[PDB]
């Protein structure tokens, strides 16, 4: 059964961008909206939208540069079978700092760069290259 | 594989067994020659190779190779043995140390002498 | 009882001594409660041949520690130099 | 402790001047320098990469006169010290008292300088020292002790060192038989003919 809708979102991104999809649609969720917001701020996607009242869909508009995927890779790290948390002094650097890690800190979902500046740890959701 | 399976049963580390069990992790052992005889090797070689059956002080009995040209060993002779198999003699897992206890060194050898137990030519 | 004494921590024919607080029943080099300083019999005249925390020594004496004869001599020496 | 065999055979095997003789005469008049030793030495080999690395390790040892155990200790310390392991290693090898004595010019050869040291003829910073591996340090004075200045050997050695290239990091006053570290040596000054990086490769395996 569906037990990790975040890995579902990330896989929809990966597959749609490998298929050169213009946009992808998935079931919406607060955490999905937060993660999409972080990705838009870091520029990995063009836009996102939420639509409908009883069963809200979330749409992401994918981004391509010189005919190729802007998202190089997108990888779930914390997962239901094995949760991963890091202290402030242990937050990972993805691609030596060219990529991002998304961290659910106590102050909310943010990049690892932001979390280091705030001095926080948190649950590490995914890596994005 | 699955982490829950590992938590239920950890990775069983293999154990590598010693090739020289009768040596009991000793570097050498003393023993008494109960029989001294010769055997053909296996293919492709041909020879008559010199071997002895030795009861060790710990009561193991082993077959041991007698290296170098000619030897003075006989039944009831007491010798020191070390590890190292001979290949082409299946089951000969040990070497007799030349120049120890009853085992003479090789008489006329002049090179690699310290492997075969023979002393410096003084002149 | 509690005592303040030297512990030999050096090399053959090259002595060096820590100044340590110990239960007198403990071995010379064994268990000790606190380390208080050091003394070197063969330090150069250019070199710090002795150091003590005289304040913590005074604290331990307030608690009833027994100072060793050589440690007492060293304390008199330091308070003569200082 | 020391290599005591035919010294110039070493230069033949390395195919180059190892400075093992004082230079009163060119070595090609004293040996067939271009040809490796022994009866088979005419057949020049195709060295493997391991052979090349080994041959450089050997060359550097065989110039400075250091056996493998001490040379590996130098390597481990140079690998602990900051900066380039190879530059550090060469700085250490150049800091030896016998080497400093040779560079200063009092010994006509490194082995002659090693005698002068070992026989308690050398003083450093005003003190007698007779340990060849003694590490000299900046601003140290080195001098001949006054009972030794009578030896002809040092005079002839000085009359040869005047022909060699002058070191930049040392200073010597030959007429007084004293000198000083003005600087430590640096990779700029030591001969580019030493492939320090092959030494690093060989011990870092």
């Amino acid at each position: 059964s569906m037990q990790d809708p975040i890995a579902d979102m990330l896989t929809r991104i990966r597959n749609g961008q490998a298929a050169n999809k213009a946009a992808v649609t998935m079931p919406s969720s607060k955490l999905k909206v937060a993660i999409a917001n972080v990705l838009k701020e870091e520029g990995f996607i063009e836009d996102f939208k939420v639509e409908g009242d009883t069963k809200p869909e979330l749409e992401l508009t994918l981004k391509y540069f010189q005919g190729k995927a802007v998202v190089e890779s997108i990888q779930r790290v914390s997962r239901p079978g094995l949760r991963i948390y890091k202290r402030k002094d242990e937050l990972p650097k993805v691609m030596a700092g060219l990529g991002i890690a998304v961290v659910s800190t106590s102050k909310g979902v943010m990049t690892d760069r932001a979390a280091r500046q705030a001095g926080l740890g948190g649950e590490i959701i995914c890596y994005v290259a | 594989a699955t982490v829950n399976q590992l938590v239920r049963k950890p990775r069983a580390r293999k154990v590598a067994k010693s090739n020289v069990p009768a040596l009991e992790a000793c570097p050498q052992k003393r023993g008494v020659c109960t029989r001294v005889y010769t055997t053909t090797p296996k293919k492709p070689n041909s020879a008559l190779r010199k071997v002895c059956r030795v009861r060790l002080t710990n009561g193991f009995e082993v077959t041991s190779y007698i290296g170098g040209e000619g030897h003075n060993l006989q039944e009831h002779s007491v010798i020191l043995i070390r590890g190292g198999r001979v290949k082409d003699l299946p089951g000969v897992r040990y070497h007799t140390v030349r120049g120890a206890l009853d085992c003479s060194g090789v008489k006329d050898r002049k090179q690699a002498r310290s492997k075969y137990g023979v002393k410096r030519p003084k002149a | 009882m509690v005592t303040i004494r030297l512990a030999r921590h050096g090399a053959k024919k090259r002595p060096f001594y820590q100044v340590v607080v110990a239960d007198s029943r403990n071995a010379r080099n064994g268990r000790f409660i606190e380390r208080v300083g050091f003394f070197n019999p063969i330090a150069s005249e250019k070199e710090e041949g002795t150091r003590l925390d005289l304040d913590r020594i005074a604290h331990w004496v307030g608690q009833g520690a027994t100072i060793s004869d050589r440690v007492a001599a060293l304390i008199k020496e330091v308070n003569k130099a200082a | 402790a020391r290599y005591l065999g035919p010294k110039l055979k070493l230069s033949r095997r390395e195919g180059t001047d190892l400075f093992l003789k004082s230079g009163v005469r060119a070595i090609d008049t004293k040996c067939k320098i271009e040809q490796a030793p022994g009866q088979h030495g005419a057949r020049k080999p195709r060295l493997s990469d391991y052979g090349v690395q080994l041959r450089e390790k050997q060359k550097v040892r065989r110039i400075y006169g250091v056996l493998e155990r001490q040379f590996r200790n130098y390597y481990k310390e140079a690998a602990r010290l900051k900066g380039n392991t190879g530059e550090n290693l060469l700085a250490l090898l150049e800091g030896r008292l016998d080497n400093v004595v040779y560079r200063m010019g009092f010994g006509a050869t490194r082995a002659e300088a090693r005698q002068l040291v070992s026989h308690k003829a050398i003083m450093v910073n005003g003190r007698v020292v007779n340990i060849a591996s003694y590490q000299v340090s900046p601003n140290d004075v080195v001098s001949i002790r006054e009972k030794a200045k009578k030896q002809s050997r040092v005079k002839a050695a000085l009359e040869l060192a005047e022909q060699r290239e002058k070191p930049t990091w040392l200073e010597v006053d030959a007429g007084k038989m004293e000198g000083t570290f003005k600087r430590k040596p640096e990779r700029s000054d030591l001969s580019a003919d030493i492939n320090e990086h092959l030494i690093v490769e060989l011990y870092s395996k």
Partner: protein
Amino acid sequence: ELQEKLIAVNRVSKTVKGGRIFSFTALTVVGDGNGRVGFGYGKAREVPAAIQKAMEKARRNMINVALNNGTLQHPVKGVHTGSRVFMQPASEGTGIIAGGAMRAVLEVAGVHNVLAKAYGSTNPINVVRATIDGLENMNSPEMVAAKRGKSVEEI
């Protein structure tokens, strides 16, 4: 300009009605330093002919890699067939910590400081493939910024 390396020579053979024909293959690499490299695999019935074919193949088939002042931009994982290669940038004076087949490629690329490890098959051909694949994937801050539209101050 070009530096050249010979990585391997291998004697392969074809069986025929009369017996065996032996042929030589040579694997070589060339590069400008400065992050341009190519590899060439040649075949001939003679060793020097194989080497010359390899060099001629390696002068074309040549790629650019965005080196970071003589080290890598970031760690990279390359894979080809059975050969997996991990590479990581290193501080100055580290040198090339690599095996021979990778050391040749990284030397002719001019990557002075690297840590590298081969895993799985060490077969030189596929190792060279995997290393070139990894270096080809590596990307640099300026074009990452161009993709994401940020200024390079984002670094």
